[PDB]
Amino acid sequence: GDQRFGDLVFRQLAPNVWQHTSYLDMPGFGAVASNGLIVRDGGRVLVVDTAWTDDQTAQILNWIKQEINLPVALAVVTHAHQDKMGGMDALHAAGIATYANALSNQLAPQEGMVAAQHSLTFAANGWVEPATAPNFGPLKVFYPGPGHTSDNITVGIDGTDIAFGGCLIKDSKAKSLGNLGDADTEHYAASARAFGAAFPKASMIVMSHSAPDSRAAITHTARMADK
Ligand SMILES: C[C@H](CS)C(=O)N1CCCCC[C@@H]1C(=O)O
Ligand SMILES: [Zn+2]
Ligand SMILES: [Zn+2]
């Protein structure tokens, strides 16, 4: 299943969907995996999240060229931390249009990230304002509320059973939500449940720091945020 391509790993999840995985030695935590997505929509490719670094992100684009060989129309990144936004400059160097929550772009400089070119804004109910996500094809973008960070967003893939929780969701047997340094501890639990309710038919939950899991990942995350 897994395909090793340099120091990255790619796994097909559905006919038009792949998970990209990249690793960063975080002193004190080991070599930490981070997952994002690659989606083919007809004659173009859409990317969810960068890798940790520009070099790794360029390797994602090289893998796309080899395995899909269609242009990358856009990328959307799911919050202003390095695992999701660390490779922005590589996307820009490649000419790819980039999108993030407006709040992620606001936070990017202080978090050490390069901002995306375009800002997404969200309705009161959490769904992206459609004019801010033009030409997103099957990507359905949802702001569940503050949790892992104030800016975290999530993405469903229409035509599949897949929803991507990014760093908000941990798998059903995880033991910790992380260090919570940037987390909204008051609202985290509600935000996790809101993600599940926004994508109620998704049976494959993809997330940044666990392999894909069933919907049990959402309720386990939500219970731990209760603490
Ligand atoms: C870099 C990354 C951005 S989500 C990060 O800070 N993490 C996630 C990796 C391992 C856990 C530590 C910390 C956390 O979530 O507590
Ligand atoms: Zn994060
Ligand atoms: Zn993360």
Experimental method: X-ray
81 Cα nearest atom in ligand 1: 3
Which of 24, 26, 177 most suits a substitution to test ligand 1, by most atoms within 8 Å of the C-beta? Answer: 26
Residue 200 contacts by C-beta under 8 Å, 6 or more apart in sequence? none
Instruction: Yes or no: say if 167 and 225 are a contact pair by the CB < 8 Å rule.
Output: no
C-alpha distance from residue 155 to each of 28, 200, 227 (Å): 30, 13, 26
Instruction: Yes or no: say if 166 and 178 are a contact pair by the CB < 8 Å rule.
Output: no
Q: Which DSSP string corresponds to the chain? A: --EEETTEEEEEEETTEEEEEEEEEETTTEEEEEEEEEEEETTEEEEES--SSHHHHHHHHHHHHHHT-S-EEEEEE-SSSHHHHTTHHHHHHTT-EEEEEHHHHHHHHHHTPPPPSEEE-B-TTSBBPGGGSTT-TTEEEE---SSSSSS--EEEETTSSEEEEETT---TT-------TT--TTTHHHHHHHHHHHSTT--EEEETTEEEE-THHHHHHHHHHH-
Domains in the chain and their CATH numbers? Answer: 2-226 (3.60.15.10)
What amino acid occupies position 180? L
**Ligand 1 neighbour 112 (Cβ under 6 A):** no
- Rg from Cα positions in the chain: 16
**Ligand 1 neighbour 209 (Cβ under 6 A):** yes
Instruction: Yes or no: say if 50 and 77 are a contact pair by the CB < 8 Å rule.
Output: yes
The experimental resolution of this structure, in angstroms, equals 1.0
21-32 residues labelled b (16+ CB within 10 A) or e (exposed): bbbbeeeeeeee
**Ligand 1 neighbour 82 (Cβ under 6 A):** yes
Q: Edge-to-edge strands of the sheet including 154-157?
A: 139-142, 154-157, 162-166, 204-207, 210-213
